[PDB]
Amino acid sequence: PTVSVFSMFRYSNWLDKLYMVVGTLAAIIHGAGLPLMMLVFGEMTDIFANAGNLFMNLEEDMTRYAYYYSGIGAGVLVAAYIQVSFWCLAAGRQIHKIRKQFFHAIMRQEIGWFDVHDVGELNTRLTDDVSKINEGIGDKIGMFFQSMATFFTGFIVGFTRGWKLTLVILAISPVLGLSAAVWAKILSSFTDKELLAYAKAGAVAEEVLAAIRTVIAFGGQKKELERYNKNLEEAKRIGIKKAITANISIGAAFLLIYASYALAFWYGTTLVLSGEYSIGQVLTVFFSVLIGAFSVGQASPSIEAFANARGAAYEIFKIIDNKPSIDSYSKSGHKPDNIKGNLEFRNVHFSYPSRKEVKILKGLNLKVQSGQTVALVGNSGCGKSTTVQLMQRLYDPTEGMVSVDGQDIRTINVRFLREIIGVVSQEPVLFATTIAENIRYGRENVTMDEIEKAVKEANAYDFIMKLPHKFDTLVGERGAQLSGGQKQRIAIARALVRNPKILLLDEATSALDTESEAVVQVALDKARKGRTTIVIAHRLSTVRNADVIAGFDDGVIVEKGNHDELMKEKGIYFKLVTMQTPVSFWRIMKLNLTEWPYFVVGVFCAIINGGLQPAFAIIFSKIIGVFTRIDDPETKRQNSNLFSLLFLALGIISFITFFLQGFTFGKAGEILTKRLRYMVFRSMLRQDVSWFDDPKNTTGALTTRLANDAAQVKGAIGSRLAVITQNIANLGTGIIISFIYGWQLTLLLLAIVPIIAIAGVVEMKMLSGQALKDKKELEGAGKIATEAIENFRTVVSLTQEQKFEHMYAQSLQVPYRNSLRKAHIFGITFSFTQAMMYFSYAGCFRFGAYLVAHKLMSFEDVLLVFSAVVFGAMAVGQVSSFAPDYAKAKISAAHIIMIIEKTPLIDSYSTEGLMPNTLEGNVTFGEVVFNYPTRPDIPVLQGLSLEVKKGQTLALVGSSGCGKSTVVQLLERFYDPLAGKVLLDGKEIKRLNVQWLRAHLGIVSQEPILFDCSIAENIAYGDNSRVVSQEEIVRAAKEANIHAFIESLPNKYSTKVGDKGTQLSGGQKQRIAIARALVRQPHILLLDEATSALDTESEKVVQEALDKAREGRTCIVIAHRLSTIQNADLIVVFQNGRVKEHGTHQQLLAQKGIYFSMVSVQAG
């Protein structure tokens, strides 16, 4: 995927071609202003040296060479501000354009093309990939052009002044260039490698973090913790190897620089003494060529970024490329005028291209006229809602030709049409806009009186009165502060204000009441004369009162006719109607006390790394003083050789000490990180379930914490220590040496040291890897990104795209302008500090000349004070910019100690309480009231009760969200029942043993999630704290006939299972959770919906393997299908949590009650 170069800059205007051209010009010209600085420095020192030999006319010549230095300073000020500001502007504009256009093209797309795309990945796209395009083309091309200029100027100066030396410097410069390349590259790709190192274990944490209730429910904690440990240790080995190699490469860069000084001066003295050169030409040639070779390395990261951009641009410019078959926008679409209600289908088929192997609808030939209200009767399995979407031109039907009133849909406007067929779907969703905005999505132009009229028609207006700020009532995400019945009433209200030409309902009475349903159906019937309508509902209540009732079976229209026709027809509708009638503390060093030896060695080697800058100051300003003095050629030669060798030795000790400080602080940091992750996880797990379900303590929150804040705390301890001591060695010694050698210049230079430090930090913060803040502040246009994609479905309701493109435009055009202001600021700062470097030369050497011509100090002493304090301050900067922050890392450690301190209620590992010897198998609940403390505003269970006997297969029947699965959390002790008193065998579970209460019993959850293991480590997960004895494992697959599928799979007991077992089909996996609980041999088996997705003959075998032990072990089945309810022992009906009637199947059926109605779905 290569976008080359021309395609990459396609989204540009005139002004930006202009910005780029003036940019590279001012970058080439800010480039060549270091080598000219060394060309002046050469002759300046060549005049200081020879001056004071019979201080006449020194201060004059220095008043001249103050103007060369200050001139180049005030030329770089400008060239650098121009380069930075102008390239950040080219990029700013170009990325804004591409971002808005990407979002615009992501709302034009065939619904099928969202089968290919995803949700989380697509948000990764529209933030990470676009910021990655920005990253290259913004400034890396500036920095790249500037460093190429400094290289070529380095060579031109070094060949103008003297070649015989620049050839040697150059002939070892390939190794300098290469080592600079590797150093800089390692620096840019440091954070990215780390995440790659953590990937697996991180993904293993998320899975377990999400499904925590399950891995509680079995014995599975120790397994999940060892599982983690293994991949953690792999992250540690990869980590410390990376630390070793990072430091080797850095240490060898320094060794090579210093050995390069050694060669240059050992050769330069041969030349100087021979007569040819002087000390000025050698300083010039050497510094200019040495700086040029080193700079090229800085250019290399810029080259890699361009490869990254013109790669990611492939996929982004892809969504920009293709036009969906059914153009959602499409202004060329035909528009009808005399649109009378008609509906025409003929031999209609379709498959959801997410599965094109199965053709689910295998024929439909339908003709419906105006006002004709049609219902569709048939099981879940026929495919009504498929037709529903197919009508709205949300797809192309494959066979036949669908039309409406003469002309066909395939050639006419989809916005207009998708409109005039107003729909409500099965599970409509609620937006986090203002309530009146949700509604007004009927039209850009709507009046408040219309909203009032429609909400009094739908009769969803009482709760409209009840809420605060009757027309300002803020809903949150998804609309879950209020009820679900009101939620369906207002989805109704929306497809009502949409005022369509046809009204298509898909079960708009999901969890709604009766009287509101009747008023809603009457208000519907108010608009069913001139506007065609069709209802897709299982609730027969709003089904009987329509004109036509048609019958699906196997996705085909089998039974045709009106009500009476289906009565006399003996189809499916006949049987149906027949049976229906914070405070942060510092205690954090103590988390890493075990590693005192690494720290001792580390502080020692950091002291020495710090001191290695003043040692160079002295040695350098002495190998210069040698050529200033008046000596023999023998003394000049011997001292050149001695100081060359001291240059080599400083290099070697630099190598070894960097390698050690790096390796050692690295290894202590990795070890702290690993034990902190493992221990914070072992304390996450044992915590309760209330702590887990609590909002603000979620799966995203917790994985971010456990995958970052551990590494943050690592940063605080070791980094703070290494940087403080290295800097104190460096600059403390620079300034003390400086006061001793010089008594007047160091005082003037202390007034510049702060600015030099700041200059070093700003330069390194750039080359290191300056990132954008929007990637954290911008948040995703706020929350318009996720919402548009996540809740993409009610946008699969109407068009209402523009009203999202434009909300994007606002919430994204605000920060944009703040980014331009930030470009101007960063430009001025990055120029002003560099300019301060050049004016540092000028001020320090002019004052040095005034001191030297009054015999208060020498040229050795001024070259010492200069080099030591100035480049000591610069190196204080360059090193303090690697230091991780200390506000964040301290708050982070507060969070970690917070968790590692938290004491979960009723410790899962605890044997404290009551440990009984005799067990019977009774369960009794008395006035047990409960509400989930996570919902303090809705009380969910209002004090039910039960009585259980041995082997008593207790039927629990109710609705969805009203007390079928809430005893999973009362009996297995997740949420303590606040009101009531429970009797399991008459024994209070509040004193019982918890890892035994779940040890004794085992259930089949509402859904099984499985894991990253083998079926030998997935079923066998059914029991733990006991070895897997396979003669039990062989038969757990056998009792449920699931031994068949497994032995056919390769690696019969060792076939790989990926994440959540995404390989097999349902019929083999839902069999496994049962096979899971078959090795469990639970004395009480709380089964919930073991007949959701299974064949009817293996439902027999799971029920018999349940049955062949349904004696003697207490049983309880909670499900919809009556295949398990009539063969259950007792029944207890549920309606919003209240227990009304109980009893035997022959007793609750002799009375016509509610269970008479709960039989009436499909039995007959």
Partner: antibody
């Protein structure tokens, strides 16, 4: 101009020891190489010792090594040569010396001081 | 090691003429660095020598025009043309390019009258 003037001198029995000085003024003493030079009774010069500006680089001819030790004080501008175990061939006249910047070896001879060793 | 002969020992010049002095070193005095150092110190009577010519052809600042040193390989001469009356004394050719820095012999200059 520069003046170098020395003292010391006189008469010392064989195997003796003494210390010739050389106070130099006028030329910022802490930079130049210095030398001693010796002129025997036949008016025939000879080199004796040299010390570099730093002070940590002294060169003596092959013969008179070990028993003569040259050194300097840069703070007071003085150059001392300390002689011991002198023979009967040490009767001489010793001069200081300076060092021309363009490689001219002895360029500013101070006045002489003479040293006679006899029983 | 390096020893320096000086060919004319005693010289009989007449005031107003040209005189020549020669200094032969065995061994081709030439340093490692590439120069040859060979001064021509001149001492008067009752005086401590003064420099006259350094690095074979140069003249120490403050010398007349007529002292010309010329040096080929291992033989070096000094020519005084138009001999004045304050140019009497003894000449010394001191070489410093090798390990014991010798001072050579000594040639005397007498003006006839």
């Amino acid at each position: 101009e520069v003046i170098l003037v020395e003292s010391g001198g006189g008469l010392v029995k064989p195997g003796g020891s003494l210390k010739l000085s050389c106070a130099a003024s006028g030329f910022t003493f802490s930079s130049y190489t210095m030398s001693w030079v010796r002129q025997t009774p036949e008016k025939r010069l000879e080199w004796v010792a040299t010390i570099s500006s730093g002070g940590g680089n002294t060169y003596y001819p092959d013969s008179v090594k070990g028993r003569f030790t040259i050194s300097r004080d840069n703070a007071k501008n003085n150059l001392y040569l300390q002689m011991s175990s002198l023979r009967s061939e040490d009767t001489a006249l010793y001069y200081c010396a300076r060092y021309y910047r363009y490689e001219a070896w002895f360029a500013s001879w101070g006045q002489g001081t003479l040293v006679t060793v006899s029983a | 090691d390096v020893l320096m002969t000086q060919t004319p020992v005693s010289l009989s010049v007449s005031l107003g003429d040209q005189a020549s002095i020669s200094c032969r070193s065995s061994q081709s005095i030439v340093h490692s660095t590439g120069n040859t150092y060979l001064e021509w110190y001149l001492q008067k009577p009752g005086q401590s020598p003064k420099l006259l010519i350094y690095k074979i052809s140069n003249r120490f600042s403050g010398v007349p025009d007529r002292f010309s040193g010329s040096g080929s390989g291992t033989d070096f001469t000094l020519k005084i043309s138009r001999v004045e009356a304050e140019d009497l004394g003894v000449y010394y050719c001191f070489q410093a390019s090798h390990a014991p820095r010798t001072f050579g012999g000594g040639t005397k200059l007498e003006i006839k009258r």
